[PDB]
RNA sequence: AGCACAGUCUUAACGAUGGAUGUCUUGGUUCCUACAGCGAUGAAGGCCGCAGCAAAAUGCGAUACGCAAUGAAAAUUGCAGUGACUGAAUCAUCAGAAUGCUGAAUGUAAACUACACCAAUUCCCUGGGAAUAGUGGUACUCCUACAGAAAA
RNA sequence: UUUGUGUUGAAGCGAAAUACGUGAGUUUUCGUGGAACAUCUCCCUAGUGCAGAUCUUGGUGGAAGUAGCAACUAUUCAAAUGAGAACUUUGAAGACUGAAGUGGAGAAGGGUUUCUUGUCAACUGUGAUUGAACAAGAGUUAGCCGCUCCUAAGGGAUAGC
RNA sequence: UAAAGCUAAAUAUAUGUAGGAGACCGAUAGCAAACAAGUACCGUGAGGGAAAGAUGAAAUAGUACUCAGGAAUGAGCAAUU
RNA sequence: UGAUGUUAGGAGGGCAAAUCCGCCGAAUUUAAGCAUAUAAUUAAGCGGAAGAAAAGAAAAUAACUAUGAUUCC
């Protein structure tokens, strides 16, 4: 909705922040194996549950 | 780059003065990083640690 | 262990302790044997290998070659000698990694720290 | 009718029964009773029952950060006097 | 340049698809031994933040992937950087200092970063000189003192 | 417990044998494989032998290039871009919605789908240079619009019981 | 010798933490979880709950060069082992 | 003697449970059916502690040539 509370809007911002891919230079590390983030979300497919 | 043992003999007034000038320098570095001038982005770590040491001495 | 029951002889436990050792403990693991000449000058039998020492290679495809240690890699458990090199498929040059237990060292680089060790080790 | 008990009446189904809960963070706070169906927030206790072993272990003592308790171990074998410090040099 | 009908079924040789078999294991399981609670001096749990480039997990708290002190003791790295000729680069120990908003949650409320009353508050030199709308206190029940008032 | 094989190639697997046994099975050859494997000299021990249970988990068929890709009146000519245009863009036509509109503005619900630039591995059940897909950066400004205040049907508490 | 009171040891421990061990299991087995596992995901809610280990001694050897092709990719007299 | 007091100094509240203390309280099942009985002074529910808790120094046994606080094998 356009009408929101403070806390809910902060939660929406936090949940948008965590939907980004792994940094590219982090792949060039040694001792590392993580190719891609296994927790990725699309808006039309999985609901936040709020 | 500062060491704790060289600070133990200072007075409170000048300890606070050193903290203030460190804060000004860190603010300047952050302002410079906000613009696309990444020449000195590696100096922030040292200034942060220096702030921590000065506060440690003052609080003890 | 052999006769004290307060330490383990289990393959699982001490094979786990080897591969997750803290960086401070890894330098004691990376030790090499002394030559006969250095075994009379010093009473010691072996020392942890350090950077600017001089070594002789005793096992592997590069056995017999001598040189100076240029770098130590505590995470891969290997050392690098000055003229034992390699070509990548690009053509770029690198060093060949040698395990410190395949090596005997023939000349030390002494300083304040190693003096106090060689003194006690007598 | 046209909003019958299947597909039709599912379209009327907006609105919320539960929302986020202060004191446990789950979407389990009845907005009209004003009471959590998981932790029972308004009251002082925690609302846990012995017929659910699985639920009882999703939110026990060791499943969190243990912020203050974790620093309290290994004192029992050092047993220093409070205010002490190692010898200098 | 020439010669095999097509389909269906059978058998060999070489391949495709699929992930059994054998070998491996920083993981489980059971037994034995020792020790044992935390909290109004704010717990367990929840939320929000912190890195030069930084999503998760791990670690930390406006000093925020770490400060001081003690024991070792040259490196640490993807790039950029930082370090000695040993309070410094890194590891371990961990007693000093610091520890956001909440939560029994305790000034009144709560799908509010809403609203009260009382005391203005905090620094630096050694009585001056400064800064700041910032800080602290106020639940209920009960015990020992105390204070005055009231009945008798 | 005894006494044995292995980088001069173990276990496993595929095709076999002038081989042995009534039989369950032993044994050996060639190929692949790259690190372990037995004991029949005699004993001990068990989560110890599969064709089925509309058995459990995983993988694969004939059906089969088959059923099907039919609501919502309808498309055509030229040009641009591009490796490649019936379903991207431009111009010209022929038409629809017909103010009770696929026109404007809000609530509940969603949470960045909004904007600019780039771009096609997968998706957009035909194509695709398109896109609500993917990537990098941006964007929401109040004394007067609202909440915040009042009381309602009602909820939670205090004293006592 | 009731209608008041205190008291160590020999006993127990499917919890938490640390140490040792076995004629135990060996990735459809063993805890649900050998891995960012009470995680991803489902339900208004109380709750439900997975799949997923192995190149090589070394990648401080992870595929340079040429030709064809818009590319993907293929081939070689060319290349690591 | 009640009450009042932001008077001074203090205590209680929540989490955790394998072992421990107090209350409350079933049915499945067996009896080849079933009602007493059994399951069981158990599961679920509500309160309170410790490195152990509880119990404990005879208003106890015996009937002997007599033993002698509690606990456990
Ligand atoms: Mg809303
Ligand atoms: Mg939907
Ligand atoms: Mg119905
Ligand atoms: Mg309702
Ligand atoms: Mg024929
Ligand atoms: Mg206690
Ligand atoms: Mg927090
Ligand atoms: Mg010193
Ligand atoms: Mg030091
Ligand atoms: Mg409050
Ligand atoms: Mg309101
Ligand atoms: Mg009360
Ligand atoms: Mg065998
Ligand atoms: Mg091998
Ligand atoms: Mg069986
Ligand atoms: Mg079968
Ligand atoms: Mg057809
Ligand atoms: Mg289409
Ligand atoms: Mg019409
Ligand atoms: Mg018309
Ligand atoms: Mg009309
Ligand atoms: Mg758009
Ligand atoms: Mg676009
Ligand atoms: Mg298509
Ligand atoms: Mg997107
Ligand atoms: Mg108005
Ligand atoms: Mg009313
Ligand atoms: Mg008595
Ligand atoms: Mg007693
Ligand atoms: Mg074990
Ligand atoms: Mg498993
Ligand atoms: Mg019966
Ligand atoms: Mg019967
Ligand atoms: Mg019956
Ligand atoms: Mg019970
Ligand atoms: Mg209690
Ligand atoms: Mg007692
Ligand atoms: Zn709750």
The answer to whether A48 and A35 have CB atoms below 8 angstroms apart is no
Beta partners for residue C47, in sequence order: C32
The answer to whether chain C touches chain B by having 3 or more C-beta pairs less than 8 angstroms apart is no
Given strand D35-36, what is the order of strands in its sheet?
D18-20, D27-30, D35-36
Task: Give the residue from C23, D20, D2 showing the smallest Cα distance to A10.
Answer: D20
Identify from D20, D21, D25, D31 which residue to disrupt to test chain A contact, counting A C-beta atoms within 10 A and taking the largest count.
D20
What sign does the dihedral C59-C62-C66-C72 (CA atoms) show?
negative
Q: In this structure, what are the phi and psi dihedrals at residue C56, rounded to the nearest 5 degrees?
A: -130, 130
Q: Give the closest nucleotide to C92 (alpha carbon vs C1').
A: G64
Q: In this structure, what are the phi and psi dihedrals at residue D38, rounded to the nearest 5 degrees?
A: -105, -55
CA of A18 to C1' of H9 (A): 53
Residue whose pair of structure tokens reads 């009882």 in the numeric block: D56
CA distance A19 to A14: 9
Report CA Rg, chain D: 24
CA distance C38 to C3: 34
CA distance C112 to C121: 15
Q: Give the closest nucleotide to D52 (alpha carbon vs C1').
A: G47
Q: What share of chain C is helix, strand, coil (3-state, %, to 5)?
A: 30, 35, 40
3-class DSSP assignment, residue A22: coil
CA distances from C87 to C67, C96, D11 (A): 19, 10, 68
Beta partners for residue C114, in sequence order: none
Question: Which residue intervals of chain C are DSSP H helices?
Answer: 11-19, 23-29, 36-41, 112-120
Q: Say which residues have a Cβ less than 8 Å from residue D21's Cβ, sequence separation at least 6.
A: D27, D28, D29, D36, D38, D39, D41
CA distance C77 to C99: 7
Could you list the beta-strand ranges (E) of A1-50.
none
Given strand C78-87, what is the order of strands in its sheet?
C46-48, C31-34, C103-107, C54-57, C66-73, C78-87, C93-98
The answer to whether C72 and C30 have CB atoms below 8 angstroms apart is yes
Q: Which two tokens stand for residue D52?
A: 């659910």
CA distance D46 to D52: 14
CA distance A6 to B43: 36
Å from CA of D26 to ligand 16 middle: 47
DSSP for D24-80, please give it: T-SEEEETTTTEESSS-TTSSS----TT-HHHHTTSSGGGS--TTTGGGSSHHHH-P
For strand C78-87 and strand C31-34, is the pairing parallel, antiparallel, or unpaired?
unpaired
Q: What torsion, rounded to 10 degrees, do the Cα atoms B11, B16, B22, B23 define? A: 170
Å from CA of D57 to ligand 31 middle: 20
Least CA distance to A7: which residue of chain D?
D20
CA distance C49 to C57: 13
* Resolution of the experimentally solved model in angstroms: 2.5
Q: Does residue A30 lie within 7 Å of nucleic acid chain E, judged by its CB?
A: yes
A-chain residues near D19 (CB < 8 A): 50
A-chain residues near D27 (CB < 8 A): 49-50
Report CA Rg, chain C: 17
Task: Give the residue from C110, C103, C105, C112 showing the smallest Cα distance to C57.
Answer: C103
Q: Give the closest nucleotide to B16 (alpha carbon vs C1').
A: E124
* Residue D20 forms contact with A (CB below 8 Å): yes
**Which residues sit directly before a break in chain B (C to N > 2.5 Å)?**
none
Least CA distance to D22: which residue of chain A?
A7
Contacts 24+ apart (CB under 8 A), B48-51: B50/B1, B50/B2, B50/B22, B51/B19, B51/B22, B51/B23, B51/B26
């Amino acid at each position: 909705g356009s009408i929101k509370r403070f806390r809910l809007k902060q939660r929406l911002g936090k949940c948008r922040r965590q939907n980004r891919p792994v940094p590219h230079w982090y792949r060039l590390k040694k001792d590392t194996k993580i190719r891609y983030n296994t927790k990725r979300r699309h808006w039309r497919r999985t609901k936040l549950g709020l | 780059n500062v060491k704790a043992y060289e600070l133990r003999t200072l007075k409170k007034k000048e300890l606070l003065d050193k903290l203030d000038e460190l804060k000004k320098e860190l603010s300047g570095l952050r302002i410079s990083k906000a613009l696309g001038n990444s020449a000195k982005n590696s100096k922030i770590h040292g200034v942060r640690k220096n702030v921590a040491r000065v506060l440690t001495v003052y609080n003890q | 262990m052999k006769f004290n029951k307060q330490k383990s002889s289990s393959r699982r436990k001490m094979r786990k302790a080897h591969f997750t050792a803290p960086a401070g403990l890894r330098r004691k693991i990376m030790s090499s044997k002394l030559s006969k000449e250095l075994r009379l000058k010093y009473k010691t039998r072996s020392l942890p290998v350090r950077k600017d020492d001089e070594v002789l290679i005793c096992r592997g495809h590069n056995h017999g070659r001598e040189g100076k240690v240029v770098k130590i890699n505590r995470k891969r458990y290997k050392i690098y000698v000055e003229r034992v090199t390699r070509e990548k498929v690009n053509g770029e040059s690198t060093f060949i990694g040698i395990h410190p237990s395949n090596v005997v060292l023939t000349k030390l680089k002494v300083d304040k720290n190693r003096k106090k060790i060689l003194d006690r080790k007598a | 009718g046209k909003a019958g008990k299947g597909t039709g009446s599912f379209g009327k189904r907006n609105g919320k029964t539960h929302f986020l809960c202060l004191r446990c963070g789950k979407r389990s706070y009845h907005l009209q009773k004003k009471k959590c169906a998981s932790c029972g927030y308004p009251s002082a206790k925690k609302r846990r029952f012995n017929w659910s072993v699985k639920a009882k272990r999703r939110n026990t003592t060791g499943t969190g950060r243990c912020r203050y308790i974790k620093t309290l171990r290994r004192k029992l074998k050092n047993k220093f006097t409070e205010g002490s410090t190692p010898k200098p040099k």
